[PDB]
Design a binder for this molecule. Structure first.
Ligand SMILES: O=C(N[C@H]1CCCC[C@H]1Nc1c(C(=O)N2CCOCC2)cc(Br)cc1[N+](=O)[O-])c1cc(=O)[nH]c2ccccc12
Ligand SMILES: O=C(N[C@H]1CCCC[C@H]1Nc1c(C(=O)N2CCOCC2)cc(Br)cc1[N+](=O)[O-])c1cc(=O)[nH]c2ccccc12
Lengths: 302, 304
């Protein structure tokens, strides 16, 4: 029993973190085989960031303009190139702690663990969801760029996020490990803002199943509702529409608890237009949307 | 910017987790140097659990009744002894991945990270507080016993919790690495119940400081308070009383924000009186009490 916001164990990823310095900028790099991956803005001065020409800036650098430190050993850089917004630094030593890994690009609504790092050293791990507006509500200070987000399946690390920036509202933006940005953002110091966000409805329903699994049942009701009748109510409260595929993805949880998906929607609808009336669910006064159906199944089954 | 319930990186502890089996009972062990630590109830059948005499049960065991597995490798058990509620299995191999470590016993209100494990394999990490009633609000299933809680200070892992059981209300109880339970709980399947819990007041204040550090001031007010008036009010909301040691512990946060501790106490009093009125603080609609002052300074300063 119990339900916590649980991150994946971070050991496989700690073994890949390094410090990348170029000029006056120091940040974090990801060391996999004989390549270090890090944000391309490491090569910019603050004046460069106002309007950077990365191709032109990178040509002015040689391999010796990059210092890479893993622990107390300085890795020799033998080549450099860009892929989209990530810099790839070839080093003369392969990382012996390189795990089985893949680069994957995730969708809004999917969760992942973040290993927050500074100067190549881990500070902590936490669990994040990609918001529908493609930001993440992270915890990042100066020097955090290059920290990565990831999932683990069996022995294989799926890197999905590399951190690049903080927006004026204090939320964060980054790229996949192929350097493609999540959301309409650019690595330039210019006016940028997070769009209006919505709530990940499939994740809220999964978390309501987690609460029922853990004995919170006061919000279940006698009513039922159609998917289109629910979707019309949800859209008025800035909730993402529920698709039929979402319902199929909630099948396992509905079978475990015996509560039809549309019966849980009927409860969620009543929660949205009535509130919680001073009560809590799993220790929260808000409807939580940073647990996917798979996350609930995993934590409630090992 | 931002504020998250952040756990310590788990790598140094991941390399210490093993699987311990005795009979048909399996659970997790902690392998440090040539010793594996685990809950002593690994030697019990379910019939033994109502009124076990662990001295009598252990004397009937031999070294070869314990199978300890680290990955695909079996570790030969060469000795065994009990210390309070933990079993110490000596093995013929010292753990090459042993970190620098310490055994500590924490206070009510302090936090630590839990590496939840099953069959010797870590499956997740999260941050916990020792509640005032000496339980933790964990996430644990059958097979999780022997999972550990820990902090990191400098280069050293401070182990502070080993998991033993789940109480009827779904909260959790365990021991330090000496085998002494937190609270009045015992490793018997007898009627046990968490007492009534309280809110960790010094942690709520530290968290309000994190909100200020992150740029929010809407909950401050022009009032101050005496410490004794603050405690008279706060205890009517089932908040733990605030001591002068606590006030000194909030010093660094108070000095960084320019808000005196007793002025933050005034704000807390008003929050308890009014609630948030449809607002949130660092993403929460309730007053969070599972961040210590040291947690706040660490996450707001980038300690690695
Ligand atoms: O070091 C961080 N950022 C650097 C990294 C490389 C240089 C540009 C900058 N990134 C941004 C930012 C930005 O982060 N800031 C933060 C406030 O000051 C300026 C604007 C905004 C836009 Br718009 C575009 C970019 N960009 O294109 O890289 C940074 C990261 C973090 O998560 N949180 C922090 C908290 C405090 C201070 C710094 C950070
Ligand atoms: O395997 C777990 N526990 C086992 C470990 C071996 C000894 C007995 C039992 N510990 C207890 C418990 C207890 O946990 N339970 C669990 C529900 O059914 C019975 C009562 C209560 C008291 Br009172 C005393 C003890 N004791 O003395 O060990 C266990 C751990 C967990 O965190 N969460 C779970 C969720 C579901 C099922 C099991 C667990």
């Amino acid at each position: 029993s119990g339900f916590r916001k649980m991150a994946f164990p971070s050991g496989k990823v700690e073994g890949c973190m390094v410090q990348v310095t170029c000029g006056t900028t120091t940040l974090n790099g990801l060391w996999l085989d004989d390549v270090v991956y890090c944000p391309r803005h490491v090569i910019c001065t603050s004046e460069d960031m106002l309007n950077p020409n990365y191709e032109d800036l990178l040509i002015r650098k040689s391999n010796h303009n990059f210092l890479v430190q893993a622990g107390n050993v300085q890795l020799r850089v033998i080549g450099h190139s860009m892929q989209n917004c990530v810099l790839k630094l070839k080093v003369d030593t392969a990382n012996p702690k390189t795990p089985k890994y893949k680069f994957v690009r995730i969708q809004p609504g999917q969760t992942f663990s973040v290993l927050a790092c500074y100067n190549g050293s881990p500070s902590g791990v936490y669990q994040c969801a990609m918001r529908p507006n493609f930001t993440i509500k992270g915890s990042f200070l100066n020097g955090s760029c290059g920290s990565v987000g990831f999932n683990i399946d069996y022995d294989c690390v799926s890197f999905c996020y590399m951190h690049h920036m903080e927006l004026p509202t204090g939320v964060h933006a980054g790229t996949d490990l192929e350097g493609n940005f999540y959301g309409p953002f650019v690595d330039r110091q210019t006016a940028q803002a997070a769009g209006t966000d919505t709530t990940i409805t499939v994740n809220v329903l999964a978390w309501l199943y987690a609460a029922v699994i853990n004995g919170d049942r006061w919000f279940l009701n006698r009513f039922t509702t159609t998917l289109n009748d629910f979707n019309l109510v949800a859209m008025k409260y800035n909730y993402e529409p529920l698709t039929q595929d979402h319902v199929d993805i909630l099948g396992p949880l509905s079978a475990q608890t015996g509560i039809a998906v549309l019966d849980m929607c009927a409860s969620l609808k009543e929660l949205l237009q009535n509130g919680m009336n001073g009560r809590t669910i799993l220790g929260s006064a808000l409807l939580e949307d940073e647990f996917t159906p798979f996350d609930v199944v995993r934590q409630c089954s090992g």
